[PDB]
Nucleic acid binder design. Structure first.
Lengths: 117, 120, 52, 94, 130, 125
RNA sequence: GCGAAACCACAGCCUGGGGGGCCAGGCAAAAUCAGCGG
RNA sequence: GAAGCUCAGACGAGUAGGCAGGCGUGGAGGUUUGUGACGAAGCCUUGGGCGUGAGCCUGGGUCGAACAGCCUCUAGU
RNA sequence: UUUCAAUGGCCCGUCCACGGACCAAGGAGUCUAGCAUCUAUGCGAGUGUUUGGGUGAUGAAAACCCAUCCGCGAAAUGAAAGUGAGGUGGGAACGCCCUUGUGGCGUGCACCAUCGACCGUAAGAGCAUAGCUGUUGGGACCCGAAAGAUGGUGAAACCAUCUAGUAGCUGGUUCCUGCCGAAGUUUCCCUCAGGAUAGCAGAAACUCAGAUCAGUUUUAUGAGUAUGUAAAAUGAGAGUUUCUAGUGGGCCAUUUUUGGUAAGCAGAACUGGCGAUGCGGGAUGAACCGAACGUGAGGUUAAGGUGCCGGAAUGUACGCUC
RNA sequence: GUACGUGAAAUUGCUGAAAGGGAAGCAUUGGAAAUCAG
């Protein structure tokens, strides 16, 4: 089954653009005349549960593999069973010596590495 | 006491073999057959099982029984396979015919990817 | 922060003893030992008794 | 538990003690119950209700029919005759 | 209530056993037992050994909850009880003086459909101030 | 359509249009929009076994028997029509008259329109 | 040459309708200096 | 993973209040044969991926010595 | 990502007014005692070791063990001396049938009742701990008011304390998603502010598979076209006892309506909707016309509309007007 | 490099790109250029 994402653009907090003190992270408004809370025309859209994506295609990359974070080679040995549905992702702090050990091991085990470079 | 009370201790949440991820969990134990925290897989949880692993271009199968399940030194019985891939598939499944055969698929699957690893 | 917080907690002595008996019994299940994290795949038998 | 509190989910939104005859036989040791109750013996037990924490005996319950001596500081009017058909007597403490 | 409020792992085994029996037999005994395993501790009050003795002489006796002891009564009849828990005094009195004590897992082995079993309950008053 | 429904449709006279259905209209509605209230569920009449499992007692077996019991208004009209989930129709193809909320006799589209329901339900399917 | 402070939601063209932000109109060319209304 | 799996149908505004499930923070016990001078933590980026969301993971840059996943305990979160 | 075009979009919080130049860090329902409810754990007519003693060589302020007491419960009642305790109906479950079943038949826990007795008893259910929530008191969610008191230093003022003095009030109160969701008012009590019972909103424990209910109408009326009443249509599973919040404002329009007049009005009773609510149309809009909102695709409508801005006939037909 | 570990934001200077006729900011849909992936 392919992937369809019900929405691509992120959710940005209201007036996040206007102010640097207002973060770019979603907080639900609480004013009783807030046009954003009252969902007027041309206002920003509030996150709802209706936007949730398909269960069979959730936490899936556009190549249909769920990203499993890998710290050492003994974690890649765990993806032995699930090479057809999980993609091994190298942790960002694994040193250069271990990183090549994981990539070579994953190549031998037939486990795709998201950030092999 | 028995397999289900042990299950609700070692299996359900806390083990030394569990890996909980973004939405699910794995099972690191070497003697597993799926890699998942499932009853039909977890030996700490369940009685006699069978699963295979890889050593230096060679395969080995481990088996256990119930009378011996209290003596951990010789609890697992190992058999070494160093002949061929298709032979290994037949050497494994033949020894598990008297055994429930629901997990023969998982066992046979494991040998294939272990063999594929040896080739690659 | 005050020093007359509740630092120590009362427990019924009986459930203290229930806990020990339960944990002693769990010390004699080899499977519970493995999840706890003890590399005892070569231990001769459980409970592992030794000479006096 | 300040992790499970409600402020956590709100971040962002603005001298005569009494004994009765039914309990009377229990004050005596369990061993001598098995050798004084139901056996016709000349020696009768002594149930010193004072030395267990009560000063008065009340009339609740029925009586096993073994004559028994009961030592009390006080006794109900309808307690004492109930032990009379039981064959025992109330012995009053000075 | 779809599950008991207790983290007792042994209780979840009784519920698991009696969730199977509830949907796989027509035994209204099983459905009643499964529902009463869900009820809280306040709704599973204790029954006494004497009261059970009276109720049998007024078949295995089944009570979900505890079976305490009555010291006022002296010579205990022969009884076959099956309860969640037994007080130490009550268990000695039932076992030494006459019959035997059971448990809800054993009772399922005995009478999976609950045939020839009396399902008693204890006075649900607690304090009841007024 | 009885006397206790005369006033039933007079109180909500401006809110409903009602009329006498011919055979074709009753036939199409159940065939294309026929959902039976089964086990408190809106299960479509994909086959006759669904009706029988629900209306077997009233000697109703297939859709046509159910259609016959409806059209002829038989002894089991109440149970059959109660078993029929309220048909969910589409806004009519071509639209209504301009002033839809006036009485039908007055050029609107509310109220008793007699046979013309059979000329409307075709638009509503 | 030296060199501030008040003050600052955002800004700044008018008529009419509901004020500078809305609707419909009139119009609409940078950067600036000087006197000076609201 | 019986806390699972499977079939079906209906419903979706929401203030006061009511109710459950989660995300992040500092420390504690346990665990991961866990990460690290072959570059920890932080920080930055017109780089990528994930989640409806709080948030998370990652490439490159900068940097120099410690840090984290999991089960639980605690709060000057 | 940046820009461009088309359509849309009033500045946020607060109560017009007050706050807001910008940024980083800090920053507010906490600890604790008592009580109440609920859930869990241990035990059970008991229950609670941690005032102490014992013991602990290795983290010895931990863990572990225990004597006598004592707290609460195990009996009440009187002000006090003193005294001091069922059967009928249903009914959960089981058995039993006739042969399914139905029904009958037993059995009857809880509880409900009636109908009975005993002085409240009637075959005891608590005790401890931890958690959640509620409430009362401590600085007591954070900040903030005019005085005062003590003891001083100057020549009434000043200084450090009491002091985090006093709040009925002002301002702020920090993460997400989901579910459910009001009242906006009678009732009374009530010197005073309020207190209420009830209704609306919920959570748990128990009956009948009902002809039990219904913002409905019929049937039968009785009396004066209406009025109330009791007794078929239609839909719906209807119920109950127990507690725990929130609320008791107002605005708009209809009905009569009595009192009114240049004319407004004035007064109730009554009914709705807004109050918690986006959306299309009405150029613009608090009450007007439509319509109640998960996220998207197509189809089709409502009210409103089709000269152009503007999506859609510079349509058809018959007429009036300079 | 002692204005000395890391060196954020506000704030400013230059460089490059872009747009600007009495607002900007944002939203949906696409083009243009830039860039990334599979």
């Amino acid at each position: 089954v392919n992937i369809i994402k019900k929405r691509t653009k992120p959710f940005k907090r209201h007036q996040s653009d206007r102010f640097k003190r207002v973060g770019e992270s979603w907080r639900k408004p609480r004013g009783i005349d807030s046009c954003v809370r009252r969902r007027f025309r041309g206002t920003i859209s509030m996150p709802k549960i209706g936007y949730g994506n398909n269960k069979k295609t959730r936490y899936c990359m556009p190549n249909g593999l769920k990203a499993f974070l890998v710290r050492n080679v003994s974690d890649v040995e765990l993806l032995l069973m699930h090479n057809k549905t999980y993609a091994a992702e190298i942790a960002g702090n694994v040193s250069a010596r271990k990183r090549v050990e994981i990539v070579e091991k994953a190549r031998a085990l037939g486990v795709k590495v998201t950030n092999a470079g | 006491q028995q397999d289900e009370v042990i299950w609700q201790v070692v299996g359900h949440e806390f083990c030394s073999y569990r890996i909980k991820g973004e939405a699910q969990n794995f099972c690191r134990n070497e003697y597993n057959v799926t890699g998942l925290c499932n009853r039909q897989s977890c030996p700490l949880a369940n009685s006699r099982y069978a699963t295979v692993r890889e050593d230096n271009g060679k395969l080995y199968l481990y088996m256990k029984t119930i009378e011996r399940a209290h003596f951990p030194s010789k609890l697992w019985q190992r058999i070494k396979l160093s002949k061929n891939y298709a032979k290994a598939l037949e050497q494994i499944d033949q020894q598990l015919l008297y055994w429930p055969g629901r997990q023969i698929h998982r066992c046979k699957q494991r040998l294939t990817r272990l063999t594929q690893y040896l080739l690659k | 922060t005050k020093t007359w917080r509740k630092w120590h907690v009362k427990v019924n002595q009986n459930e203290k003893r229930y806990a020990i008996a339960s944990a002693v019994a769990a010390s004699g299940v080899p499977s519970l030992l493995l999840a706890r994290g003890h590399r005892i795949e070569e231990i001769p038998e459980v409970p592992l008794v030794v000479d006096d | 538990p300040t992790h499970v509190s409600k402020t956590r989910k709100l971040r962002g939104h603005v001298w005569r003690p009494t004994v009765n005859l039914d309990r009377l036989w229990t004050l005596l040791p369990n061993e001598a119950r098995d050798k004084y109750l139901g056996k016709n013996t000349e020696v009768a037990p002594v149930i010193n209700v004072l030395q267990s924490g009560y000063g008065k005996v009340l009339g609740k319950g029925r009586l096993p029919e073994t004559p028994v001596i009961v030592q009390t500081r006080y006794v109900s009017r309808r307690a004492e005759e109930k032990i009379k058909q039981a064959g025992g007597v109330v012995e009053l403490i000075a | 209530r779809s599950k008991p409020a207790s983290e007792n792992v042994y209780l979840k085994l009784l519920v698991k056993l009696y969730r199977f029996l509830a949907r796989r037999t027509d035994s209204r005994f099983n459905k009643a037992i499964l529902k009463r395993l869900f009820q809280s501790k306040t709704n599973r009050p204790p029954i006494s050994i004497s009261k059970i003795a009276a109720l049998t002489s007024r078949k295995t006796t089944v009570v979900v909850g505890t079976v305490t002891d009555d010291e006022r009564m002296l010579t205990v009849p022969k009884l076959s009880i099956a309860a969640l828990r037994f007080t130490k005094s009550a268990r000695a009195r039932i076992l030494k003086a006459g019959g035997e004590v059971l448990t809800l897992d054993q009772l399922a082995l005995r009478a999976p459909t609950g045939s020839n079993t009396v399902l008693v309950r204890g006075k649900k008053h607690a304090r009841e101030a007024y | 359509f009885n006397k206790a429904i005369k006033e039933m449709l007079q109180v909500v006279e401006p809110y409903v249009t009602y009329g006498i259905p011919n055979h074709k209209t009753v036939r199409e509605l159940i065939y294309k929009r026929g959902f039976g209230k089964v086990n408190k569920q809106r299960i479509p009449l994909s086959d006759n076994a669904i009706i029988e499992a629900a209306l077997g007692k009233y000697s109703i077996l297939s859709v046509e028997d159910l259609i016959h019991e409806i059209y002829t208004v038989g002894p089991n009209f109440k149970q059959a029509a109660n078993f029929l989930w309220p048909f969910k129709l589409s806004s009519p193809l071509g639209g209504w008259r301009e002033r839809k909320f006036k009485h039908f006799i007055e050029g609107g589209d509310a109220g008793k329109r007699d046979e013309h329901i059979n000329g409307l339900v075709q638009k509503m399917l």
